[PDB]
Automatic annotation (TrEMBL):
Pfam short name (any one): Transpeptidase
GO molecular function terms attached to this record: beta-lactamase activity; penicillin binding
Residues covered by the Penicillin-binding protein transpeptidase domain: 14-229
Keyword Hydrolase: yes
GO biological process: cell wall organization; response to antibiotic
Family to which this protein belongs: Belongs to the class-D beta-lactamase family.
Example of a GO cellular component annotation carried by this entry: plasma membrane
Organism (species): Acinetobacter baumannii
Keyword Chaperone: no
EC number in record: 3.5.2.6
Annotated protein name in UniProt: beta-lactamase
Catalytic function, reaction form: a beta-lactam + H2O = a substituted beta-amino acid
Keyword annotations of the record: Antibiotic resistance, Hydrolase, Signal
């Protein structure tokens, strides 16, 4: 419940960021840089959540389709394989979502993103990269509401599409608890911005949504977004 101690894990991991908690439309802030919570950032791979929903709902793909790897080299060897939407989500495989995005196309993408009102709701002109280098931007409080709605099936999509994307996002399962969430890491902008947006599904059915945002640098291990989040949810006794 403090708020000062959570400042000190942020203090020591020599980062700058904010953890936004939403418990039934009540927003709390934690970190060492609470001002981040209202500044716009590129969403990075957290936009895969809304990309999937738009693609599924408009029947540009489905949860069974297998995306074929056509042999070109990709940033990670784990990405060099055939995979579904959901497997691409768990690995944040940009090429699959770029292909998806190109099927949706610019008009449909822009119309949906502003109908959802996602962040600043601007995708510019290149349909396959606006979530990594602009011009699409989003504050971390806006991300905790988005994933909050998704968790309660309240987004302006059908419920079956939402439920489909939610099963793509299961991260841990321990003690009757479930953690869902999506990581992001914009490595190609300065300063780098890391994301971990999701929700906790407590055994009694309660839902607490979070959006960890932090400045990033090339040397940190990717698990730093998980470490900081997990021990903050334990400190706040959400888990
Ligand atoms: C999403 O935010 C980025 C995007 C900018 O490429 C990618 C890069 C990193 S690391 C890839 C993890 N691979 C696999 N098993 C992530 C991320 O997972 O946070 N997403």
């Amino acid at each position: 419940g403090h708020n000062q101690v959570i400042h000190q894990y942020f203090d020591e991991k020599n980062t700058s960021g904010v953890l936004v908690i939403q418990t039934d439309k009540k927003i709390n802030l934690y970190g060492n840089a609470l001002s981040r919570a209202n500044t716009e950032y590129v969403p990075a791979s957290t936009f895969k959540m809304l990309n999937a929903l738009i693609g599924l709902e408009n029947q540009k793909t489905d949860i069974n389709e297998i995306f074929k790897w056509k042999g070109e080299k990709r940033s990670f060897t784990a990405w060099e394989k055939d995979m579904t939407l959901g497997e691409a989500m768990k690995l944040s495989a940009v090429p699959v979502y770029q292909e998806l995005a190109r099927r949706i196309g610019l008009d449909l993408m822009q119309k949906e993103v502003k109908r959802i009102g996602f962040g600043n709701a601007e995708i510019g002109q290149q349909v396959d990269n606006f979530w990594l280098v602009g011009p699409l931007k989003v504050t971390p409080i806006q991300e905790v509401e988005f994933v909050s709605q998704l968790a309660h099936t309240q987004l302006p999509f059908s419920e079956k599409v939402q439920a489909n994307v939610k099963n793509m996002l299961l991260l841990e399962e321990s003690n009757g608890y479930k953690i869902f969430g999506k990581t992001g890491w914009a490595m190609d902008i300065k300063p780098q911005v890391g994301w971990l947006t999701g929700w906790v599904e407590q055994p009694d059915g309660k839902i607490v949504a979070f959006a960890l945002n932090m400045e990033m640098r090339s040397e940190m291990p990717a698990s730093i977004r998980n470490e900081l989040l997990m021990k903050s949810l334990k400190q706040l006794n959400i888990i």
